Enzyme design. Sequence first.
Site, PDB file in Angstrom:
ATOM      1  N   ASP A  82       0.856  -1.219   0.000  1.00 49.79           N
ATOM      2  CA  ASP A  82       0.000   0.000   0.000  1.00 49.79           C
ATOM      3  C   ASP A  82       0.883   1.257   0.000  1.00 49.79           C
ATOM      4  O   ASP A  82       0.510   2.235  -0.673  1.00 49.79           O
ATOM      5  CB  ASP A  82      -0.972   0.011   1.180  1.00 49.79           C
ATOM      6  CG  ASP A  82      -2.142  -0.946   1.035  1.00 49.79           C
ATOM      7  OD1 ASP A  82      -2.426  -1.381  -0.108  1.00 49.79           O
ATOM      8  OD2 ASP A  82      -2.768  -1.246   2.068  1.00 49.79           O
ATOM      9  N   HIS A 116      -5.504   2.969   3.587  1.00 47.00           N
ATOM     10  CA  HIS A 116      -5.405   1.489   3.721  1.00 47.00           C
ATOM     11  C   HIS A 116      -4.175   1.139   4.565  1.00 47.00           C
ATOM     12  O   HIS A 116      -4.331   0.395   5.551  1.00 47.00           O
ATOM     13  CB  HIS A 116      -5.370   0.787   2.356  1.00 47.00           C
ATOM     14  CG  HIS A 116      -6.558   1.062   1.500  1.00 47.00           C
ATOM     15  ND1 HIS A 116      -6.589   0.736   0.161  1.00 47.00           N
ATOM     16  CD2 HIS A 116      -7.744   1.644   1.778  1.00 47.00           C
ATOM     17  CE1 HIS A 116      -7.749   1.095  -0.348  1.00 47.00           C
ATOM     18  NE2 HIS A 116      -8.475   1.654   0.624  1.00 47.00           N
ATOM     19  N   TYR A 120      -3.810  -0.511   9.045  1.00 51.27           N
ATOM     20  CA  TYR A 120      -3.039  -1.625   9.660  1.00 51.27           C
ATOM     21  C   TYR A 120      -2.384  -1.127  10.952  1.00 51.27           C
ATOM     22  O   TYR A 120      -2.384  -1.884  11.944  1.00 51.27           O
ATOM     23  CB  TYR A 120      -2.031  -2.201   8.662  1.00 51.27           C
ATOM     24  CG  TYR A 120      -2.683  -2.775   7.432  1.00 51.27           C
ATOM     25  CD1 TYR A 120      -3.594  -3.813   7.534  1.00 51.27           C
ATOM     26  CD2 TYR A 120      -2.415  -2.266   6.172  1.00 51.27           C
ATOM     27  CE1 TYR A 120      -4.216  -4.341   6.415  1.00 51.27           C
ATOM     28  CE2 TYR A 120      -3.028  -2.785   5.042  1.00 51.27           C
ATOM     29  CZ  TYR A 120      -3.932  -3.822   5.166  1.00 51.27           C
ATOM     30  OH  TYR A 120      -4.537  -4.343   4.062  1.00 51.27           O
ATOM     31  N   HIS A 210     -10.348   0.479  -7.948  1.00 49.39           N
ATOM     32  CA  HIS A 210      -8.970   0.832  -8.389  1.00 49.39           C
ATOM     33  C   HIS A 210      -8.551  -0.097  -9.534  1.00 49.39           C
ATOM     34  O   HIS A 210      -8.087   0.416 -10.567  1.00 49.39           O
ATOM     35  CB  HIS A 210      -7.980   0.765  -7.218  1.00 49.39           C
ATOM     36  CG  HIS A 210      -8.234   1.766  -6.141  1.00 49.39           C
ATOM     37  ND1 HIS A 210      -7.370   1.934  -5.078  1.00 49.39           N
ATOM     38  CD2 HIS A 210      -9.233   2.657  -5.962  1.00 49.39           C
ATOM     39  CE1 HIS A 210      -7.832   2.876  -4.283  1.00 49.39           C
ATOM     40  NE2 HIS A 210      -8.975   3.333  -4.800  1.00 49.39           N
TER      41      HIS A 210
HETATM   42 CU   LIG Z   1      -5.701   0.671  -4.903  1.00 48.48          CU
END
Ligand SMILES: [Cu+]
Lengths: 309, 136
Positions: A82, A116, A120, A210
Amino acid sequence: NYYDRSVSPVEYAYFDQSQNMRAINWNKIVDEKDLEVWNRVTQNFWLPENIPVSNDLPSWNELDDDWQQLITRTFTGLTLLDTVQSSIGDVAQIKNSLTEQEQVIYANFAFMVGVHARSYGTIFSTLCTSEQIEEAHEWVVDNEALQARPKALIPFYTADDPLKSKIAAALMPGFLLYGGFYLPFYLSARGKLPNTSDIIRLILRDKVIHNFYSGYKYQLKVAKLSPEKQAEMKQFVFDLLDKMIGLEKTYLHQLYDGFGLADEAIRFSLYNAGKFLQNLGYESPFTKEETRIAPEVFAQLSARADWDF
Amino acid sequence: KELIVYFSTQSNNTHRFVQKLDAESIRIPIDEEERIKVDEDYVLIVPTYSGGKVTQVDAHGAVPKQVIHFLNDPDNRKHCLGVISSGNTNFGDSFAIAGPVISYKLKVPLLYQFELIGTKEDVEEVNRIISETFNA
Ligand SMILES: [Cu+]
Ligand SMILES: Cc1cc2nc3c(=O)[nH]c(=O)nc-3n(C[C@H](O)[C@H](O)[C@H](O)COP(=O)(O)O)c2cc1C
Ligand SMILES: [Ca+2]
Ligand SMILES: [Cu+]
């Protein structure tokens, strides 16, 4: 017409200073699909703060140190991917955009993949110790099989072939993280870390769009090339995916070593490899059988698996 | 008289799936200013566009506006033998929910669910299900 005798700023900046710049026009839209995607990703805005994973503490404390370490390592590995996509991958797409709106949509993608990666951290902050966190970071840095995957994609982002950059931009949300996303769904099928799975489902709701969007824009560009160069790009896609499937398998066999999850994780990975190909407009060669996972684990992904009257 | 009525946006995923099927197909126009009349029995094949909205699942916009406009005409509505819906399982509990919504609104069977442009198995299965739907 002003549009045909002007360039967007990002075109001016990187490709053509011979013309004056036009402001983005949201009133006269070239592609309605851009408005469809912009409206959905902006309306789907979320932050990990608004999902309380404190209610996962009971199920988390029941897991032994090996399973807690696996989860921390897996999620820190996804954090890396990410970080790559947020800081390099999505922003690199902006200058290669077919439309003005696409430039702003990829800015949204870069921000939201950033969210994103941040999510975490929110999970680790609640569940893990400072020692468990730093150990996972050390493990990611020193894991060559893990490092190989982003190292294979980054060159396409920094090189001057927009189509190869676009394929990489689709492959990241389309394929590369699903080997890791298997773990939270496996656990939530046993009632373990259920609130964590709610964050994963919000992440997937972004990544699915995406992959679709990057795939949609790829197909519009390749369709303009000669039949020969189209065949060459198709060969490159299958060759790159073959290589990335190889690196992913190597990584997942190490990640899930002694847990017995690698087989199902790889099948889930190949399921998503099939969907990556389809959203690039290519037929999936994978059978229903060799992409199958346990129904109870798939149920955690999807339970589903103006009117005048 | 096997017939498919389908909708597909500019991305043409549903269009490509339908063109792989045996039966003759008619496309519901993207342009909201345009409408079609179908006077023969058909299976409806549509993608889902709710975008995984949550209030519980929010089914608003699951069925594209062009499909609603088509079904709003009672001449068109009465000829629907059943609905096949598409989407992506990564939308979770919102996966392919255009099907259930139409199935409920029309009182017709949800015949099948698939993803994107479909696989070899999806073509094989949907070919058979459409044949049985028209025979039975
Ligand atoms: Cu993405
Ligand atoms: C903005 C947007 C929202 C979507 N929402 C959903 C959804 O709620 N459920 C689902 O199963 N699929 C959803 N999808 C996936 C599409 O249904 C899928 O890409 C489909 O193959 C598109 O068909 P078409 O190309 O014929 O329009 C969505 C796609 C987009 C771009
Ligand atoms: Ca999709
Ligand atoms: Cu930990």
